[PDB]
Design a protein around this ligand. Structure first.
Ligand SMILES: OC[C@H]1O[C@@H](O[C@@H]2[C@@H](O)[C@H](O[C@@H]3[C@@H](O)[C@H](O[C@@H]4[C@@H](O)[C@H](O[C@@H]5[C@@H](O)[C@H](O)O[C@H](CO)[C@H]5O)O[C@H](CO)[C@H]4O)O[C@H](CO)[C@H]3O)O[C@H](CO)[C@H]2O)[C@H](O)[C@@H](O)[C@@H]1O
Ligand SMILES: OC[C@H]1O[C@@H](O[C@@H]2[C@@H](O)[C@H](O[C@@H]3[C@@H](O)[C@H](O[C@@H]4[C@@H](O)[C@H](O)O[C@H](CO)[C@H]4O)O[C@H](CO)[C@H]3O)O[C@H](CO)[C@H]2O)[C@H](O)[C@@H](O)[C@@H]1O
Ligand SMILES: OC[C@H]1O[C@@H](O[C@@H]2[C@@H](O)[C@H](O[C@@H]3[C@@H](O)[C@H](O)O[C@H](CO)[C@H]3O)O[C@H](CO)[C@H]2O)[C@H](O)[C@@H](O)[C@@H]1O
Length: 710
């Protein structure tokens, strides 16, 4: 087919944006290797110190922590959460139908690999290599660097692999080790089945795969200690049930070291992506835990499903797959482009629409798009961009008015130009340390910043780039599609740099980190960037529709430029996005990935690697929580991402009971969502309710009047 991991461009962003070097540097990165540190990846906590060494790294189904200081010697700590704690906030009328408010994973030390040589010392640490799907973490004795353990940490791994080099294995737990079967016969051999007194019972199997066998001694209720330094690989795996023991034994010799991802489009309107797992050897089968969405989209013709499951941190049960390669297919790409699928409104609404569209174009674009920050500014531009788009495709929308179409396009251009030109209130800088673009606002005073990292929503520390830049890309592509010659060079360069910051698919584009905001294993985007202090719960994502908005923009930029691989790339990602959204974030009845009483919530809230919280970053009101999952409403969100089956379920459980009471512009959001399933009733209400600062009344009514069952 057609290869999707290509560069978008190779243009030098130093030609558009002033240059900087990010002030906040990784701490533990191997300087000598010439790989870019990811700012929004599930590996990212590894590059940084954190409060009490508690920040987690979650390949899943294992949670890892490094050098946390509890039941003795410091090492690699394992938590494999069979169960989870639920919790609520004191009940409110602001949150009417809710008992379950959050799901967390207890920070407990199921087991920990370390050594005796580290009783009286803290190990040095370094991430020696990494890729999209793995990182290698070395722990060595201080000023004895030849005395180390290497931890190849890989997405989905079924065991933890420790390569001990001249260091004396020590295993410990918070729990009592209530028995030790060595070689299924002080304890000796190459296999060690240990059982904990925790609940559910944890069983691990330790395997030594070096030259010599291990000899271990119970030093305390939770310490097994080797008899002399070991050199060679140890592995430990959780035994999920008695019947998978042969399974873990057979695959003990083979461990993952990383992985290669490619992706192609398939002539019959589909695309796919392949993870080629990298391993130490092919001498036994590769066991790899998969997420739910993996199961529903993998090409079975090359894996074997097992029944061996373990819970992940926040995604539901994981199921182990046997096989070296995974090809994940998305066969139903979005057909959405610029307009809704039914492009022309119910005609008896056209007069109303035009009237409204004329009041809206009379708005002051500068004052509605030159806001305190980039985020709300971008909201403003995309909203008017929509108006310029429907007037200038009157061919399809049947909204003819040459003179207003021209105005709607000109006023947009004049609004958008200061951004094109990087003269907005919070301009960008090209960052040469992490290879992306950052807003100036949150940088130090000594670089023109406010010295406040939380400024512009964390964007200076790489939070929210898909959210913020999605707005500018949709606006850029809309402009470029309606006027391909207006500032064409500068427009391409700039727009493509923003795209590249978020979603560079190819690292021969060496100006930008690859897939800054996108995670090929989880099948979704991460919002949360660098957190100086530590990301105690890993990556977070709030808004799904601001992620969707970005890839929509990217697709639109593909259409606007005739860029096929880009257009398909963006489509594949919107498919995988759809699939993960329904698996983990917008819960249809029948969802196995969450407790019954979180599913009743209908939306996950703020999603993290180690928790879920039913709340927002900006107020605990029902309509905020659900509202953020409903803007920007665009043809992508409307036609393709938010299904009628989901809108209906969400309406009936929570929202139809509070929406007629809401007086803030949150009404406007809500009833535009409601139009998805009942535009007859939504329309009258959108005639009168308030608009979110990124919604217009004309577009709200036009969209509503295009629902084909109006
Ligand atoms: O209408 C009532 C109030 O509405 C506000 O406008 C809304 C606006 O808040 C909302 O923002 C969304 C962001 O949450 C999201 O950005 C995330 C960050 O918020 C979050 O940073 C948190 C920080 O908020 C918290 O207080 O401290 C944390 C400590 O680390 C910090 O992490 O981090 C996330 C990355 O990890 C980041 O994604 O994303 C978007 C903007 O960046 C928004 O979608 O958006 C709503 C929809 O437009 C707004 O309505 C008003 O400003 C208030 O004045 C009103 O009272
Ligand atoms: O309205 C008055 C003032 O309220 C502020 O808005 C709050 C908002 O700050 C709050 O956000 C919370 C976060 O505080 C919290 O972040 C956690 C970190 O602080 C902690 O150290 O790390 C963990 C992860 O390890 C983070 O959870 O996280 C929760 C989600 O778990 C966020 O909701 O939420 C409030 C209710 O929605 C909201 O009212 C605002 O920022 C002030 O300026 C404002 O004046
Ligand atoms: O939005 C509701 C409410 O949220 C509050 O945020 C808290 C966080 O403080 C908390 O973060 C945890 C730490 O307190 C703890 O020590 O470490 C763990 C990791 O092991 C952290 O997750 O998370 C809870 C539950 O999700 C949140 O309620 C805000 O302070 C408050 O303003 C807001 O109203």
């Amino acid at each position: 087919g057609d290869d999707l991991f290509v560069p978008v461009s190779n243009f030098d962003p130093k030609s558009i944006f002033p240059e900087i070097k990010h002030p906040f540097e990784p701490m533990y990165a191997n300087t000598e290797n010439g790989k870019i540190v990811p700012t929004n990846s599930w590996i990212s906590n590894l590059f940084y110190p954190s409060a009490d060494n508690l920040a987690p790294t979650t390949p899943d189904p294992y949670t890892l922590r490094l050098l946390d200081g509890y039941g003795g010697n410091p090492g690699l700590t394992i938590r494999q959460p069979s169960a989870k704690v639920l919790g609520s906030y004191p009940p409110t009328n602001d949150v009417p139908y809710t008992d379950a408010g959050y799901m967390i994973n207890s920070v407990v030390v199921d087991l920990r690999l370390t050594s005796s040589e580290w009783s009286d010392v803290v190990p040095d640490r370094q991430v020696t290599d990494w890729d999209h799907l793995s990182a290698n973490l070395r722990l060595s004795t201080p000023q004895d660097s030849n005395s180390y353990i290497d931890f190849p940490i890989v997405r989905g791994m079924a065991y933890i692999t420790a390569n001990y080099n001249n260091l004396t294995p020590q295993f410990l737990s918070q729990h009592a080790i209530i028995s030790v079967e060595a070689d299924e016969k002080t304890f000796s051999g190459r296999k060690f089945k240990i059982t904990m007194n925790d609940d559910p019972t944890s069983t691990f199997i330790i395997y030594s795969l070096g030259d010599k066998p291990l000899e271990l001694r119970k030093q305390d209720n939770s310490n097994l200690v080797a008899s002399k330094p070991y050199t060679g690989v140890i592995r430990v795996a959780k035994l999920p049930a008695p019947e998978f023991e042969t399974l873990l034994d057979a695959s003990r010799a083979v461990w993952p070291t990383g992985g290669d991802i490619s992706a192609r489009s398939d002539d019959n309107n589909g695309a796919s992506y392949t993870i080629k797992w990298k391993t130490n050897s092919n001498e036994a089968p590769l066991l790899t835990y998969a997420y739910a969405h993996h199961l529903t989209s993998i090409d079975d013709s090359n894996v074997k499903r097992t029944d061996m499951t373990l819970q992940s941190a926040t995604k539901g049960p994981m199921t182990a797959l046997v096989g070296n390669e995974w090809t994940l297919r998305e066969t139903e790409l979005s057909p959405v482009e610029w307009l809704p699928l039914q492009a022309a409104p119910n005609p008896t609404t056209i007069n109303e629409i035009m009237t409204e569209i004329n009041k809206d174009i009379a708005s002051n674009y500068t004052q509605e798009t030159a806001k305190e920050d980039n985020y709300f500014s971008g909201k403003g531009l995309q909203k008017f961009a929509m108006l310029a788009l429907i007037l200038n495709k009157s061919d399809q929308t049947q909204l003819r008015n040459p003179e207003l179409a021209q105005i709607a396009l000109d006023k947009l251009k004049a609004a958008f130009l200061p951004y094109l030109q990087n003269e907005q209130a919070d301009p960008f800088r090209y960052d040469t340390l992490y290879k992306g673009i950052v807003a100036k606002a949150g940088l130090p005073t000594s670089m023109g910043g406010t010295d406040d990292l939380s400024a512009e929503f964390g964007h200076s520390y790489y939070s929210d780039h898909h959210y913020h830049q999605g707005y500018f890309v949709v606006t850029a592509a809309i402009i470029h599609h309606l006027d391909p010659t207006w500032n064409a060079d500068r427009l391409k360069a700039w727009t493509e740099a923003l795209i590249r910051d978020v979603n560079n698919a190819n690292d021969g584009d060496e100006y930008f980190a690859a897939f800054r905001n996108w995670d090929w294993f989880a099948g979704h985007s991460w919002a949360g960037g660098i957190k100086p202090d530590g990301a105690l719960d890993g990556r977070d994502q709030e808004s799904v529709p601001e992620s969707v908005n970005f890839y929509w923009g990217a697709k639109l930029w593909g259409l606007a430029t005739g860029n096929t691989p880009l257009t398909k790339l963006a489509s594949l990602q919107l498919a995988v996005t759809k699939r993960t959204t329904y698996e983990y974030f917008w819960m249809l009845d029948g969802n196995k990935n969450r407790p019954e009483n979180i599913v009743r919530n209908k939306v996950i809230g703020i999603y993290f690697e180690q928790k879920t919280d039913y709340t927002t970053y900006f107020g605990r009101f029902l309509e905020y929580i659900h509202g953020i999952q409903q803007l920007p409403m665009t043809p992508e969100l409307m036609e393709y991402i938010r299904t009628p089956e989901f809108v209906s379920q969400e309406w009936d459980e929570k929202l139809g009971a509070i929406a007629p009471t809401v007086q803030s512009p949150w009404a406007g959001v809500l009833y535009l969502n409601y139009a998805i399933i009942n535009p007859a009733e939504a329309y009258p209400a959108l005639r009168k309710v308030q608009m979110d600062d990124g919604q217009t009344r004309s577009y709200s009514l036009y969209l509503t009047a295009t629902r084909p069952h109006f």
